[PDB]
Design a protein around this motif. Sequence first.
Motif, PDB file in Angstrom:
ATOM      1  N   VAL A 142       0.851  -1.179   0.000  1.00  0.00           N
ATOM      2  CA  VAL A 142       0.000   0.000   0.000  1.00  0.00           C
ATOM      3  C   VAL A 142       0.892   1.236   0.000  1.00  0.00           C
ATOM      4  O   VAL A 142       1.982   1.252   0.576  1.00  0.00           O
ATOM      5  CB  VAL A 142      -0.974   0.005   1.200  1.00  0.00           C
ATOM      6  N   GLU A 143       0.422   2.282  -0.678  1.00  0.00           N
ATOM      7  CA  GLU A 143       1.186   3.508  -0.845  1.00  0.00           C
ATOM      8  C   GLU A 143       0.381   4.694  -0.332  1.00  0.00           C
ATOM      9  O   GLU A 143      -0.850   4.720  -0.411  1.00  0.00           O
ATOM     10  CB  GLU A 143       1.575   3.740  -2.314  1.00  0.00           C
ATOM     11  N   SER A 144       1.097   5.678   0.195  1.00  0.00           N
ATOM     12  CA  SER A 144       0.492   6.907   0.696  1.00  0.00           C
ATOM     13  C   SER A 144       1.509   8.032   0.526  1.00  0.00           C
ATOM     14  O   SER A 144       2.514   7.875  -0.175  1.00  0.00           O
ATOM     15  CB  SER A 144       0.033   6.725   2.152  1.00  0.00           C
ATOM     16  N   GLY A 145       1.253   9.168   1.172  1.00  0.00           N
ATOM     17  CA  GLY A 145       2.173  10.286   1.130  1.00  0.00           C
ATOM     18  C   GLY A 145       1.963  11.268   0.000  1.00  0.00           C
ATOM     19  O   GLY A 145       2.837  12.109  -0.236  1.00  0.00           O
ATOM     20  N   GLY A 146       0.837  11.193  -0.707  1.00  0.00           N
ATOM     21  CA  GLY A 146       0.582  12.135  -1.778  1.00  0.00           C
ATOM     22  C   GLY A 146       0.251  13.520  -1.253  1.00  0.00           C
ATOM     23  O   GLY A 146       0.071  13.735  -0.054  1.00  0.00           O
ATOM     24  N   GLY A 147       0.173  14.473  -2.172  1.00  0.00           N
ATOM     25  CA  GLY A 147      -0.146  15.838  -1.804  1.00  0.00           C
ATOM     26  C   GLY A 147       0.066  16.771  -2.972  1.00  0.00           C
ATOM     27  O   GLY A 147       0.379  16.353  -4.091  1.00  0.00           O
ATOM     28  N   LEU A 148      -0.110  18.059  -2.690  1.00  0.00           N
ATOM     29  CA  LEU A 148       0.075  19.120  -3.673  1.00  0.00           C
ATOM     30  C   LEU A 148       1.175  20.058  -3.191  1.00  0.00           C
ATOM     31  O   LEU A 148       1.078  20.627  -2.098  1.00  0.00           O
ATOM     32  CB  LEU A 148      -1.231  19.879  -3.914  1.00  0.00           C
ATOM     33  N   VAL A 149       2.220  20.210  -4.005  1.00  0.00           N
ATOM     34  CA  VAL A 149       3.347  21.073  -3.667  1.00  0.00           C
ATOM     35  C   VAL A 149       4.133  21.329  -4.944  1.00  0.00           C
ATOM     36  O   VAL A 149       4.169  20.490  -5.846  1.00  0.00           O
ATOM     37  CB  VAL A 149       4.228  20.437  -2.558  1.00  0.00           C
ATOM     38  N   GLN A 150       4.754  22.502  -5.023  1.00  0.00           N
ATOM     39  CA  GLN A 150       5.568  22.867  -6.172  1.00  0.00           C
ATOM     40  C   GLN A 150       6.989  22.337  -5.977  1.00  0.00           C
ATOM     41  O   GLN A 150       7.253  21.514  -5.097  1.00  0.00           O
ATOM     42  CB  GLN A 150       5.546  24.380  -6.383  1.00  0.00           C
ATOM     43  N   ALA A 151       7.916  22.799  -6.812  1.00  0.00           N
ATOM     44  CA  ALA A 151       9.300  22.358  -6.717  1.00  0.00           C
ATOM     45  C   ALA A 151       9.908  22.769  -5.380  1.00  0.00           C
ATOM     46  O   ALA A 151       9.520  23.772  -4.774  1.00  0.00           O
ATOM     47  CB  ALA A 151      10.125  22.935  -7.868  1.00  0.00           C
ATOM     48  N   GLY A 152      10.875  21.978  -4.922  1.00  0.00           N
ATOM     49  CA  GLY A 152      11.477  22.212  -3.626  1.00  0.00           C
ATOM     50  C   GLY A 152      10.738  21.606  -2.458  1.00  0.00           C
ATOM     51  O   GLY A 152      11.026  21.957  -1.310  1.00  0.00           O
ATOM     52  N   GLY A 153       9.788  20.710  -2.711  1.00  0.00           N
ATOM     53  CA  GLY A 153       9.042  20.048  -1.661  1.00  0.00           C
ATOM     54  C   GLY A 153       9.748  18.812  -1.143  1.00  0.00           C
ATOM     55  O   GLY A 153      10.890  18.517  -1.502  1.00  0.00           O
TER      56      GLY A 153
END
Lengths: 114, 102
Positions: A5-16
Amino acid sequence: QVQLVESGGGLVQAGGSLRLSCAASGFPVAQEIMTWYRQAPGKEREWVAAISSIGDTTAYADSVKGRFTISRDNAKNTVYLQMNSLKPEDTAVYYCAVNVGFTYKGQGTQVTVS
Amino acid sequence: NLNNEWTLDKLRQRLTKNAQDKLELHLFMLSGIPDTVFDLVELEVLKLELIPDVTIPPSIAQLTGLKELWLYHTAAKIEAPALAFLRENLRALHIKFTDIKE
């Protein structure tokens, strides 16, 4: 019966920075090769990073040289996909695979990058 | 190009001292075996992991001190002189596989 199972997604620009967890179950066997695959919509399989069965030696693709990293911990049978200074073109749903009979691809968690 | 990449000094820096007190040189995630690794005749245990379409060169006979060969998920072909040298010099073989063809 091993499930990834996978997690840890999100919304962020470069440098995250994010850590996708390749959590395994069934029984503690987290001492094998974990081959990560990335799948942007409209393409096919592309290897990301693999870890040796020893676990002390590994390497990543030249496109992510010096930024991508992988680590693991057998306490809870998971593998963390460490990321930092990501390019805006890396927004894709990834997969981690361990070759035990089958090259098991997990559910796949999308990561959104602007 | 891979043979050209790894110089003798880089490989000697890659040398490891394992728990069995012998000279270890570990190569992981490589297309094939660089021929430069066979220049260091002082190698004792050789570990190779995920090496595709690998053919064992005859130059393996230079590794006089080679004792242990580790093949992790790797199917390898071997030359006749290399086969003879391993038949008359090899001591330990570590085979980790997931299929019969490996």
